[model samples]
Target: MEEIEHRTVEVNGIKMHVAEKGEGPVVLFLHGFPELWYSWRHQILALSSRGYRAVAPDLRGYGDTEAPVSISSYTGFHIVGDLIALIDLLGVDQVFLVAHDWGAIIGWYLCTFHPDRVKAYVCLSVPLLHRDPNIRTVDAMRAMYGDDYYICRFQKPGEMEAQMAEVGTEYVLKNILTTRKPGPPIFPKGEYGTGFNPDMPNSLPSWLTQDDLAYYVSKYEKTGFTGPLNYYRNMNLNWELTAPWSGGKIQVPVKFITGELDNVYTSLNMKEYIHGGGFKQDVPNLEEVIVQKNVAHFNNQEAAEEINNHIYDFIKKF
Candidate 1:
């Protein structure tokens, strides 16, 4: 971990903060919401030591990267553009992608929009979904999950931001990271930060140390939650912008891994969707799917060693 290097690169009209190590075939890591390059700290070290250059960027909004204030700037095109520019600046034509959560969503866009730039993708948590031509993405979600759904609740500009401020950043981060809830993250009306128990766990989970939590806290302290929340704000807009590719298929080879307990996997009949042929219909080259037992949303961190092996085993073949 000490050997990892940090640098800043200007890409697509914004400066991005990247943490990278070692040298070989490049493996670019993209993080999810409420996370940073730090989320892949384990993979960066593990993969780099095994002869791959691991690069994790604080994508656009979070951490030290420049955050564009407009919600419009957080679309699939903008985020994927930054990544493609970062790849060009890396002096490589193709790269291996390892991404989770929102990063995984962008990975799908990257694979669909620019397939040649990626050798293979190791996607965690989120999977590529068929975009509905009749309805916008967020609206469809709102119709099914309702306004109390965490994603829906995040739609209002300052409402969720104000609530995050009221509860303090550490609690927000801790609650998210430590949560073991099984279903979709529904917060009920006006009850996001308030839903969690006031007397939070005094001890940190085995996967996350005090130092780790402190690192996240310090970064969020500076950046706040607005930039991150803006990603949720652009869901419907992204849907509209990508209409041409509504029935697009991601042609790139992919190895998908998710936790059985992940809300995304369990909710919305994802098991049936993934195991019942829908996942393969959208991504033809999906080579493998492994649902880790007893793991939650943050499976990469919660089960780092296994995830490391899962990534190395597949990417090595490519």
Candidate 2:
């Protein structure tokens, strides 16, 4: 962490806070929901030491950066538009990419709508799916995963945010980082403990330390969870707004990694798209793929060194 540096810059008409280390061809790292630039802490230190620059940001709606109250302001256009503005502000014409969860989803759009911006992409947890002409993702999520599904549950504004507040910052963040539970993130709001417990033998899992949790705690305590939950709130809008790029394909060089125990591993038609057919047709330059063993949702943190190497190995190719 000491090796890294932090700064704030104006991008896409919004101010964004960025974490950077090293200095070379830029590699932009985008984080997922409920996460900040801190989630890429290990990668920052590892990559900077080896060579090459790494840039990770709080993103539009996460910690440190500005979080707009309007759910419509949190779509791919807003998020990816912020990123392009950030890179342009930094004077980099192109970037090597590494993203996870919602970050990966945004990266896909970045490559699709603006393939020239990404030199190569190594995305994790989320796979790019061909846009459905009829059903929006939120509809499919609600139908397939049922109401208990976290994405489905997050559709209502202020409901999950209130629940997260009731649960407290550190506890919710901890539960997200530590749990091995498989299912949509249906967090029961008011009943924090009943929904997500904080009473453990130790505050942090052995793989994660207390200070890490403390850092997350301090940030959320200050910023609140309303901004983070807004990502889910805009699912329907994201689906609707992205209709323009419906048949578009991502033509950049790409690699995808995931956890064998990850929830997305079982998403609708995922097995077929990943190992079977649609993946390549969607991401034409698809190169490498890895499924980390014994890992869950947060594969990067759970297998830091290996993921670091995986990112570097792929990015260096271009």
Candidate 3:
């Protein structure tokens, strides 16, 4: 694997920090909420070793990337613009894209709105689905998972920001790093979905290690969670802005990778929806829907070797 190099580029008035390695076909990796370019470390090394130019960026408002003040600035359209701008700055018209969590959401929007700019997409954990204008706020949680969904609570302004900010990076780092475990059942069942667990303790899962947590904490101590939470703040704005292109199909080669224990697959009938409307029309060259048994939300980190092999095999086709 090639040694990763760091570079900064001005995109959409923000200084975007990117980590690059290797020297062949371009593959851009985008990270999700509360994560930096480091989240793709395994993929970066693996892809680079395979002779592909692997690049990961600290998405707008995370890590070394500039964070805009207004929550409205983090809209999906703005994110897509920032990514497209990054590609333009790289002197490439198009490249392969791989994203996880919120990054996958942004990649989905980009593929829908600007299909010309992406050669292929590998959406990890999250699948591309139609944007329902009706499903716009925290209220949307009611339709999907009823009340008591923590994610709904997170959508509120100032609350999550205040909580995370008050807890500081140390707590956030601990939560992320300790939320993983090895072997079968990576995370507890209650942690995966909306269930009536009255006495359930809301502690970090058992996958992340103390060192992993410390690394995240140290990084965020220099940065903050403000930029990451900003992503949640723009949910409604993102929906409105993307409405025009919401229903459009992806039309490119795409793959969906899901963790078996990930509630995202079981919750709200996401699997049916993705296979029915989203993947059917959007992806002309749909490859496969991989399900890693016993894995949880952090499948990329929890099952790195398996995920890497799947990605390597998938990319080899095109």
Q: Estimate each model's TM-score.
A: 0.97, 0.94, 0.85
Q: Where does candidate 2 stray beyond 4 Å?
A: 185-203
Ranking by lDDT: 1, 2, 3
Q: Give the root-mean-square deviation of each candidate in angstroms.
A: 1.4, 2.0, 4.7
* Best TM-score among the predictions, by candidate number: 1
Question: For residue 82, what is the lDDT in candidate 1?
Answer: 98
Give a tens-digit lDDT track for model 2, residues 252-298.
99889988767777566676789886898877788767888788778
- lDDT of every predicted structure (CA atoms): 0.89, 0.81, 0.73
Candidate 3 lDDT over residue span 1-318, tens digit each: 247899899998899999999888788998886788888888899998888989999999898889888878888888888998888887888888888988998998888778888888888877875677667754575565544455654566676555656546675555544332222112222232212222333554454555666666777887777778778777777767766775566687888888876656766567776666656666667776788887866777778778778777877777
Clash list (residue pairs), candidate 1: none
Comparing 1 and 3 by lDDT, which wins? 1
